[PDB]
Amino acid sequence: EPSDVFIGLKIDQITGINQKEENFSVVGSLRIDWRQPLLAFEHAPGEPKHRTYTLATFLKLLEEKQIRWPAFTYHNQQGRMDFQNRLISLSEDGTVMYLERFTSTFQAPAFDFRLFPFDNQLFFIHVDSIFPQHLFRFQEMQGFSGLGDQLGEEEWIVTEVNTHLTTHNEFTKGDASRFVLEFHAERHLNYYLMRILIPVLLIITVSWFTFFLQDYTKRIDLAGGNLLLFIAFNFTISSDLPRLGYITLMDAFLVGTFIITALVVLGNVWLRRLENHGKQALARKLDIYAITSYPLAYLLGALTLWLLFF
Amino acid sequence: EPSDVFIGLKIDQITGINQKEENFSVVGSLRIDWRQPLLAFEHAPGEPKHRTYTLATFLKLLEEKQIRWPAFTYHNQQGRMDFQNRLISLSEDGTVMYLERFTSTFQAPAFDFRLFPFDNQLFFIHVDSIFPQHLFRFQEMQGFSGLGDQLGEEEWIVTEVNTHLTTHNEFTKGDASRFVLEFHAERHLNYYLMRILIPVLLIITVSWFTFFLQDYTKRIDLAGGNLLLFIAFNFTISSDLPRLGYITLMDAFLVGTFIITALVVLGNVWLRRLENHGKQALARKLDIYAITSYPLAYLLGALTLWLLFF
Amino acid sequence: EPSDVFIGLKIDQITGINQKEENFSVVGSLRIDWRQPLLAFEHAPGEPKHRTYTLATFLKLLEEKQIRWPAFTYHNQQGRMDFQNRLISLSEDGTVMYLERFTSTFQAPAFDFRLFPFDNQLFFIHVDSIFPQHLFRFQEMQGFSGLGDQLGEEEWIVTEVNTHLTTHNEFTKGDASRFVLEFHAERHLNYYLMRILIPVLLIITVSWFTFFLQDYTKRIDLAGGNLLLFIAFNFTISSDLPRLGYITLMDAFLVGTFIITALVVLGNVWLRRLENHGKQALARKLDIYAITSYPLAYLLGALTLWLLFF
Amino acid sequence: EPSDVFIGLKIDQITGINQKEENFSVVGSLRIDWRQPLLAFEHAPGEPKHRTYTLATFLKLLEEKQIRWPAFTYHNQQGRMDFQNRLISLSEDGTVMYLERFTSTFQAPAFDFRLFPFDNQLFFIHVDSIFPQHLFRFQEMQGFSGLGDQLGEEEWIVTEVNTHLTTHNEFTKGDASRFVLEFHAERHLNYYLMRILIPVLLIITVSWFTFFLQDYTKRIDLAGGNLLLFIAFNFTISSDLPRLGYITLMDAFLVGTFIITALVVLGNVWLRRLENHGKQALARKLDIYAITSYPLAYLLGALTLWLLFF
Amino acid sequence: EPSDVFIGLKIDQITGINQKEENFSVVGSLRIDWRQPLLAFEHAPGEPKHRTYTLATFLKLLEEKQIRWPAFTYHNQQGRMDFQNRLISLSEDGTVMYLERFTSTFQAPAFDFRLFPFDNQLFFIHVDSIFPQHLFRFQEMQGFSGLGDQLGEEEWIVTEVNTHLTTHNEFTKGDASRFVLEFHAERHLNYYLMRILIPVLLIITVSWFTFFLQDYTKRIDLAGGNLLLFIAFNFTISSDLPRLGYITLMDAFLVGTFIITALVVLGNVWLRRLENHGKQALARKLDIYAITSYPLAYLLGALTLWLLFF
Numbered sequence A, B, C, D, E: 001e002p003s004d005v006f007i008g009l010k011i012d013q014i015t016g017i018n019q020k021e022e023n024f025s026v027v028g029s030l031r032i033d034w035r036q037p038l039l040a041f042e043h044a045p046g047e048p049k050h051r052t053y054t055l056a057t058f059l060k061l062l063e064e065k066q067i068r069w070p071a072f073t074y075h076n077q078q079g080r081m082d083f084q085n086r087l088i089s090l091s092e093d094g095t096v097m098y099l100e101r102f103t104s105t106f107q108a109p110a111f112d113f114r115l116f117p118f119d120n121q122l123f124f125i126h127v128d129s130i131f132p133q134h135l136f137r138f139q140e141m142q143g144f145s146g147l148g149d150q151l152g153e154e155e156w157i158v159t160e161v162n163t164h165l166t167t168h169n170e171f172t173k174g175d176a177s178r179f180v181l182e183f184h185a186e187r188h189l190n191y192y193l194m195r196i197l198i199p200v201l202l203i204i205t206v207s208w209f210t211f212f213l214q215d216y217t218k219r220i221d222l223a224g225g226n227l228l229l230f231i232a233f234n235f236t237i238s239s240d241l242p243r244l245g246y247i248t249l250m251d252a253f254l255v256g257t258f259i260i261t262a263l264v265v266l267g268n269v270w271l272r273r274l275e276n277h278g279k280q281a282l283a284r285k286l287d288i289y290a291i292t293s294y295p296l297a298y299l300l301g302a303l304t305l306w307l308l309f310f
Ligand SMILES: C[N+](C)(C)CCOP(=O)(O)OCCC(F)(F)C(F)(F)C(F)(F)C(F)(F)C(F)(F)C(F)(F)F
Pocket: A032, A033, A034, A055, A058, A059, A069, A070, A071, A072, A073, A074, A096, A097, A098, B084, B085, B086
């Protein structure tokens, strides 16, 4: 009959989230309890009731006694894992207690940036058993798994945490146990509000303020400068995300500004051409409509973006 | 007679592709099966039918029994390889099973950027045997080799995967076995369409829109600004590729814009000089041709680029 | 009865403080004294009164004698720790002396940027015992703990240093000892004064100097350029801090400049519109008020910022 | 009498050349053959005629037999060297065969940038014996040393490869053997032609095109803008090279453009001052000379640079 | 009585100097000679007169014989040290010879940037003995210490090198030996002359050239542009140094230019205001003084900077 293995995992720190590379790094602790009757012993007088071992000596003892150990792996681990503590404790009845402290990076293949920056994401860590379920079975340790209090993350806010068990067939035809830890997070909007939304609205407001001078050439020149400013803003924004194959809300928002600036340039050019041919009265008649059509275009664009994306 | 060695390799993650340095990094697993009759044993009562070893103990046992092992290497490996699991399993008949999990970077010397960004590339991993074929022979393990489902790559799309066997003579006069895994990939165009093509066309469209004002000096000034804008665009684009010895489609596309801007400047200067000498009627007569010659030049340039490159 | 463990920690160098990632790196030394009567020995003639061991041999000796050692860990350690010296000295009465030299990075979750750049911060290092207090108890070594003289930090100035003891329940239901070292630091203002405050004031002063020309259009153009300059300054400043969820004094200072520039643009546009309709006398009458209202707005904004934040 | 040591070294990949730091990184293989009669043995029946060892076991065997080994070092190695394979093979007559695969970075102190970008450089790798020549002597292995075919370098082209032997006195009064591998390389000019030469010539051509409008103020403004453009180009160029103590051809080329722009500004200012005083006829008379003196200055500057540097 | 330990240290390469982080990295070699009569032996026939050991075997032998070894450390070492060779040689009389090759980074807390870029700096490496002087004493090995010939540094020039001995009390109440190696270096000025001094002087010269047009508004506009250019130059310069708490010569030089530009703007505004009120004769009378006061201000500023700093 297969033997039971109890698994527990806790996350202490979140050292960083890299959305450009779609990965994250944490500092955590692992606890495992496993009982093997063949490791039972009787303590001599003057000796402690529990024995302490290093990992190498414990492995050598297991090899000498020819006992199979439950090898496992981190399925979505990336790069090198730095170990701080690896301790072994053995009781008289054969129960083995193991502790592991580490820092490592893990893959996050569930990213979706369609609703950026109003998006919510999922992160997980998978622990897989190598041997099939007819030799070892995973069980959930009680009272240890979860997330810490001083995570240190400034931008992301955790919403929920869950754990469960499942199976896999990575290396054997038969099923093997898998342990899963998951959590969800969302984003703060203060940085985006302070750095992106306000400057664009201020530039648009000043450009519309300048329209009361009734200077078509000056309007054309200002719109031409604002087009380059918007292009620079788009190029700056594009550097924070991977080269995705789909269009996002921010990109649509910038393209709308591009289109509106182009339309304003065309209208001002037409008004100047009308003025140049002695139709100043017609230009003055159409100027009120030209001025009043400016904010409604942006309002309609915002409404259209909301309808399309939400 | 030589002994048979079965080889299998699977790729789980693609952590990144660096076209500037022409290399890529993956996370994969290696499986090898090899049978040696001299390692046969009989299990004692109460002991498992299979024995588990660490790598060092297995190597020490092989050295004590004086048995040659099939050493191999990754031919195109670059840098340090980080190992996560290295496990050994031995059966009673002498069959050895080996598992290896790693993360590493590999060279990609087959890059070709002539059709960038409409290019398709090839990637491969080579496994080479050190000893000649009269001692060991490689064989293909069935049902293990291939690529995973959750690769995590956002820009590249895999098209096909193949494996085969060949030979090499790196260290011996005689032939030695080689195992090859290959795949092809292409590129998404959404990022390029959103970031490069649209702004240039919009700038050209606005510059041609401004031509209806009939202001030669303003046309000259706008063209002069657009030349600097195009130079900045070219400098920004050049940073994503190595310093190649051949010209690409994007570079030709930018040079065409340079040439067209220069021609527009020359034409506007000639028109202004004609106007300054009392030939305003001649300038107005030629203005229609000057305006109508603008988009045909770009159309002819696009056609010429298509003819030259495709 | 539990045995006493004496702990001492000293910091020699501060190699860097990364406020963007909220961590710091140091070079330090650790000293521990622990007495075990079971390790007593008698020296043979011709041999020294003290014995020197490497860490591995000492651990092997402890395992052979089956003696539990007081395992510990750095709670807020991040990444890999590089060890330079790990020495063991044993006396005849069983007293063990241990020395450890290392370089490592530690988490700083107590950062607060609300008063930046007039802020004061706290840094700490935690040492935790794994076994509960009924087996081992931590004690404070005298005359060793503190900070060095040649720290090498150029921007931060240390104000005070303290040490104390506390408890934790990370791995056991019972309490376990904890050792804490803390210090506070503040910031130099010369860099900020030379790089930020002076250029903005100079630009504002030159913009107000230009007001005596009585040219509304030139004022509008200069204000439009200064708005872009201020936007560039804000974008440059934002890169030195994490994407915080709250507003800081520098951000408020930049937003005030944005608002004042917008108001100046609006006022100049209104004056130009008044002049265009034959109300030049009214514009000249209001010009004195328009000129005199410029510095009072900045003075009131500075006063309001001081009231809000201090 | 000293024993002979045969040395061979081959380079498989060139992973990068860093001219800013003056170093390069490669992937290579090392082969050594050495015969020691004290290691002779007789094979038992059923055992192979050659024995395979790991490095640690071979070193332990040598220490047990008390045999000195020929220690060596890479003289110009920088940083850590990553080893992939380290294999030992021993024959019955005592001949030892060694293989080593590595990736590492090496110093390049022979750089000279005076003729940049028309320069040719030298690279080398030095292998030094620690013990003097009265104990060991190096010999050249035949048929192994050289460079591979798939180097992967895109910018540099190899011209020749050579090997030889010499001596050194790094650690002993007597001479010790040294093995040297050298090669030369030159640079591709397509990148420089496409990115540097064409834009500058186009800007100069457009600036000279604008001279036919007969507008001194516009000429002054255009020259003032081009001066800033050239300054930006110089600052961009300077980042690709170390802070050298001597002047290069590119720097002289940029300084010539600076000087010519300054002279053009001075001439245009003088012409405008002449026009302002009623000397428009004199200004028109001198305008032909002013226009015709523009390209001859650049031609003379190019000739002078060629004379000075070549 | 204490035993004598001979120490020698040589530096082969200088791989880089980081003034922003105030550290430097080198490649060097260490040689130590120490005699212990308890390690004497007699060679058997057929064996060499000297024995070769690895570090681990030598340490195990010392532990078996229970002999204290002179442990040492690099006091100002930062980060991980990469070892290439660690060799042990023992003679029949008990003399031990040790060799160590390494690459590492060291702290430089003696930096002073007040006279930048005309500054001269000091660098040192400290080797400290752990045990007090009543057990071991350091001595200076003759003919080994110093610096190499092919250092590879391009910007810094070494002026002198010295060695000496001193004491410390880092870990014991009694004194312990210390070995010190020091050298001084200065900076090349070609890079600064070519990149900083020339462009600023050229811009100032062109701005003063433009003054002969007698256009106050154009002077104001040019000065306004040059102010932004100088601000950009200051921001670019500030990135090469740490955020120091004191003002440097370059910063004072840039602030002087700021002040002079502001004064020029004020003077031009006053002249324009005088002209606008029918005082063109007064403006023309004061124009000669305004023109002649330009270079004397810069000359006086340079003299004042020289007086203040030198
Ligand atoms: C770190 N990875 C595991 C990802 C890579 C492999 O690491 P190694 O191959 O170096 O070591 C394997 C360690 C081990 F698995 F053998 C073991 F000792 F930890 C144990 F599992 F056997 C155990 F006994 F400790 C226990 F935890 F299962 C028990 F019994 F305590 F519950």
